[PDB]
């Protein structure tokens, strides 16, 4: 359960909008204090992505990934945006680049097909059905085993076509 | 003289909760809304510069709670009745998406100063003092102008401060 990919950031809960509206470039300390980050975890499909702060992720593997995300997608971004000789072109190109990128991650929590189905034996007396899910636009290497009853909540037609 | 819910502007997935929780193909009920989301609050007697994302948990015992309940009903629960419906058409979805987008674009204006109207220097309890600008916000507009800390308003709008000061 480490950081695989950082996908996005947004203003931190319980913090005034004003804080991320300043016309100066944030520091890395600004990044940790002002934002939450949408984390894709190493052990898990995009279905299990979560927004965290630096404080809530705690002592985690893959931290340099969070730092690098901050450097590129907040700090350098804001160097370009807040530059005195920034152009209207630059802004539109950066906006469309970001949108295109976020649009692609949106694919990855959608099942394309369900590939296989095993039932798991739990430590208790009990058992739970699992589906091997191929995700949209991710390859077969990234198909993951998921709880069957989550997949039915998420993708009832794809489970029907299963059956 | 208080801090309650004035307007609920938007909702988003709660921090530390898996995305799957808001990706299910069933209509949320009000308990779902309380557990799965955060909500962007405009507070009574604060400008939109002071809006914050809160959960039902973090807002606690707060005035104007009915406004959060009505936000949930209209914009999450209703919205999902229509989207996850039967009977839904491609046109319905595009219309709803556009309506939301237009609503949220308008709110964006409200934390952007149009003009600084006046300055006063506030006398603080500790014997010190802080300057205060009266800001007219874009698209608001005059009864909603607010006194703001002068230095916030330079971090936010340095040009509309050079032009106030020329």
Swiss-Prot record, chain B:
Compartments in which it is found: Nucleus
Outcome of swapping residue 140 to Y: No effect on interaction with methylated histone H3 'K-4'
Disruption phenotype: Decreased sensitivity to the cytotoxic effects of 6-azauracil.
Residues annotated as domain Chromo: 21-83, 111-165
Other information: Present with 1620 molecules/cell in log phase SD medium.
UniProt domain comment: The 2 chromodomains are involved in the binding to the histone H3 methyllysine at position 4 (H3K4me3). The CHD1 helical C-terminal domain (CHCT) binds DNA and nucleosomes.
Self-association and partners: Component of the 1.8 MDa SAGA complex, which consists of at least of TRA1, CHD1, SPT7, TAF5, ADA3, SGF73, SPT20/ADA5, SPT8, TAF12, TAF6, HFI1/ADA1, UBP8, GCN5, ADA2, SPT3, SGF29, TAF10, TAF9, SGF11 and SUS1. TAF5, TAF6, TAF9, TAF19, TAF12 and ADA1 seem to be present in 2 copies. SAGA is built of 5 distinct domains with specialized functions. Domain I (containing TRA1) probably represents the activator interaction surface.
Protein's job: ATP-dependent chromatin-remodeling factor which functions as substrate recognition component of the transcription regulatory histone acetylation (HAT) complexes SAGA and SLIK. It recognizes H3K4me. SAGA is involved in RNA polymerase II-dependent transcriptional regulation of approximately 10% of yeast genes. At the promoters, SAGA is required for recruitment of the basal transcription machinery.
Protein family membership: Belongs to the SNF2/RAD54 helicase family.
Protein name, UniProt field: Chromo domain-containing protein 1
Primary gene name: CHD1
Residues of the full protein shown: 175 to 339 of 1468
